[PDB]
Enzyme design. Sequence first.
Site, PDB file in Angstrom:
ATOM      1  N   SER A 275      11.640   1.100   7.476  1.00  0.00           N
ATOM      2  CA  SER A 275      11.201   0.352   8.652  1.00  0.00           C
ATOM      3  C   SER A 275       9.710   0.026   8.587  1.00  0.00           C
ATOM      4  O   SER A 275       9.178  -0.614   9.491  1.00  0.00           O
ATOM      5  CB  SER A 275      11.511   1.125   9.938  1.00  0.00           C
ATOM      6  OG  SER A 275      10.749   2.326  10.056  1.00  0.00           O
ATOM      7  N   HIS A 280      -1.548   5.443   4.849  1.00  0.00           N
ATOM      8  CA  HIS A 280      -2.454   4.574   4.101  1.00  0.00           C
ATOM      9  C   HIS A 280      -3.890   4.670   4.588  1.00  0.00           C
ATOM     10  O   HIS A 280      -4.152   5.236   5.635  1.00  0.00           O
ATOM     11  CB  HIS A 280      -1.995   3.116   4.183  1.00  0.00           C
ATOM     12  CG  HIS A 280      -2.147   2.516   5.545  1.00  0.00           C
ATOM     13  ND1 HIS A 280      -3.324   1.942   5.978  1.00  0.00           N
ATOM     14  CD2 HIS A 280      -1.272   2.397   6.572  1.00  0.00           C
ATOM     15  CE1 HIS A 280      -3.169   1.498   7.211  1.00  0.00           C
ATOM     16  NE2 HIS A 280      -1.933   1.759   7.595  1.00  0.00           N
ATOM     17  N   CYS A 298       2.147   3.395  11.593  1.00  0.00           N
ATOM     18  CA  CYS A 298       1.662   4.043  10.377  1.00  0.00           C
ATOM     19  C   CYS A 298       0.862   5.313  10.636  1.00  0.00           C
ATOM     20  O   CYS A 298       0.334   5.540  11.738  1.00  0.00           O
ATOM     21  CB  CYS A 298       0.789   3.089   9.571  1.00  0.00           C
ATOM     22  SG  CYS A 298       1.642   1.732   8.798  1.00  0.00           S
ATOM     23  N   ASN A 300      -2.360   6.505   9.787  1.00  0.00           N
ATOM     24  CA  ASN A 300      -3.668   6.085   9.312  1.00  0.00           C
ATOM     25  C   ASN A 300      -4.483   7.293   8.912  1.00  0.00           C
ATOM     26  O   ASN A 300      -4.618   8.215   9.705  1.00  0.00           O
ATOM     27  CB  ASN A 300      -4.422   5.307  10.398  1.00  0.00           C
ATOM     28  CG  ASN A 300      -3.945   3.874  10.537  1.00  0.00           C
ATOM     29  OD1 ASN A 300      -2.909   3.490   9.994  1.00  0.00           O
ATOM     30  ND2 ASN A 300      -4.712   3.072  11.265  1.00  0.00           N
TER      31      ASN A 300
HETATM   32  C1  LIG Z   1       0.267  -3.567  10.327  1.00  0.00           C
HETATM   33  C2  LIG Z   1      -0.615  -2.728   9.404  1.00  0.00           C
HETATM   34  C3  LIG Z   1       0.082  -1.379   9.232  1.00  0.00           C
HETATM   35  C4  LIG Z   1       1.570  -1.235   9.696  1.00  0.00           C
HETATM   36  C5  LIG Z   1       1.896   0.188  10.135  1.00  0.00           C
HETATM   37  O1  LIG Z   1       1.375   0.669  11.140  1.00  0.00           O
HETATM   38  C6  LIG Z   1       2.692  -1.822   8.783  1.00  0.00           C
HETATM   39  C7  LIG Z   1       2.911  -1.058   7.488  1.00  0.00           C
HETATM   40  O2  LIG Z   1       3.931  -1.897   9.465  1.00  0.00           O
HETATM   41  N1  LIG Z   1      -0.743  -0.374   9.933  1.00  0.00           N
HETATM   42  C8  LIG Z   1      -1.802  -0.971  10.413  1.00  0.00           C
HETATM   43  C9  LIG Z   1      -2.791  -0.105  11.178  1.00  0.00           C
HETATM   44  O3  LIG Z   1      -3.987  -0.151  10.822  1.00  0.00           O
HETATM   45  O4  LIG Z   1      -2.329   0.574  12.131  1.00  0.00           O
HETATM   46  C10 LIG Z   1      -1.943  -2.456  10.118  1.00  0.00           C
HETATM   47  S1  LIG Z   1      -2.445  -3.453  11.599  1.00  0.00           S
HETATM   48  C11 LIG Z   1      -2.498  -5.191  11.022  1.00  0.00           C
HETATM   49  C12 LIG Z   1      -3.807  -5.887  11.309  1.00  0.00           C
HETATM   50  O5  LIG Z   1      -3.990  -6.815  12.093  1.00  0.00           O
HETATM   51  O6  LIG Z   1      -4.752  -5.290  10.516  1.00  0.00           O
HETATM   52  C13 LIG Z   1      -6.105  -5.205  10.986  1.00  0.00           C
HETATM   53  C14 LIG Z   1      -6.160  -4.349  12.261  1.00  0.00           C
HETATM   54  C15 LIG Z   1      -7.427  -3.507  12.376  1.00  0.00           C
HETATM   55  C16 LIG Z   1      -8.604  -4.187  11.686  1.00  0.00           C
HETATM   56  C17 LIG Z   1      -8.363  -4.272  10.184  1.00  0.00           C
HETATM   57  C18 LIG Z   1      -6.918  -4.609   9.828  1.00  0.00           C
END
Ligand SMILES: C[C@@H]1[C@H]([C@H](C=O)[C@@H](C)O)N=C(C(=O)O)[C@@H]1SCC(=O)OC1CCCCC1
EC number: 2.3.2.-
Length: 351
Positions: A275, A280, A298, A300
């Site tokens: 999903s 990361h 995610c 983070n």
């Molecule tokens: C979408 C990404 C990823 C996500 C899982 O959670 C995927 C794997 O499903 N997690 C994120 C996060 O950081 O939480 C990103 S947010 C996408 C964006 O606009 O990036 C910018 C936001 C902040 C500034 C720099 C990048």
Amino acid sequence: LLVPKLTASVTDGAVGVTVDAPVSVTAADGVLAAVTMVNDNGRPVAGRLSPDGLRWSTTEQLGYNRRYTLNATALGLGGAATRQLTFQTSSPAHLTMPYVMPGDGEVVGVGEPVAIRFDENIADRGAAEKAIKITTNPPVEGAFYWLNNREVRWRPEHFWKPGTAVDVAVNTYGVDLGEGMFGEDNVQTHFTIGDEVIATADDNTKILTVRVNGEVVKSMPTSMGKDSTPTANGIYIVGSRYKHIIMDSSTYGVPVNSPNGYRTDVDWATQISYSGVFVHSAPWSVGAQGHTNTSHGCLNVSPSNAQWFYDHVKRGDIVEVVNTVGGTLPGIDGLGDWNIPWDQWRAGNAK
Ligand SMILES: C[C@@H]1[C@H]([C@H](C=O)[C@@H](C)O)N=C(C(=O)O)[C@@H]1SCC(=O)OC1CCCCC1
């Protein structure tokens, strides 16, 4: 004195002869003096006769939709016997190829299921399961469970014991998998279970703690899913890892131009659900990591901790998320197999 007798594993005039086994001929009261098998247009089939002359068998793969003719002669003191037999093999409507994970010769974590994915829907799940031979050492009870119409998983009740050898023989060639679908080929893989690595993310502390064989080796501040897009609680199996990867929301069902959509390049990403949950690098939220949840779901962490996770966590290792305001990861996510209760998993769903 007795006349030699010929016995074949096929009968003259047979049709739908399955090609999951070799064809043989055996002599009694005598020995095999000549055995040939030829396809519908002259070409000989490879075979081998036993040293004692009593048994001949094909030695190469027999084909679908073939008309084979077998000629055998046995000689004994009591005389001679000769037979000619013609038979037709299975005529598939379709072929399906299986793909197995994890890779051959790989070392994986204690949560790695055996995975067999067919490139077509399987009408007869039972026939597919019966055709898959799993060997474990030390032996452990396990069971099949289907994640969808194409992919079946096999795992034990509890996480694998480190040091376990796992052998997977997918013997689908010649097997009717329902509705005229036959296996395109056999596939095989063998893997081994490595160290126990379980990383727990506790929403109460917002720390991801990595334990190796029960010992804490790493404690990572994390920022998980914000209240409106929380990280699901539950057991996640670690999948693939990327030095960098473009996260595309449409991969996981959501348009980029959408509200919850996104397309962003991120570093040191370890996938833990289909999903789209990843561990990361998130340099933008280092302030929040360990304090407040800010992500789309995610885990983070800091760039150096994300790279540490990339370097030290392997496919099949476990991430457990607890105490979030989210639900539970679906058992059939793709990497959520351990969230299915053992009684349900063991009962299976081959019907
Ligand atoms: C979408 C990404 C990823 C996500 C899982 O959670 C995927 C794997 O499903 N997690 C994120 C996060 O950081 O939480 C990103 S947010 C996408 C964006 O606009 O990036 C910018 C936001 C902040 C500034 C720099 C990048």
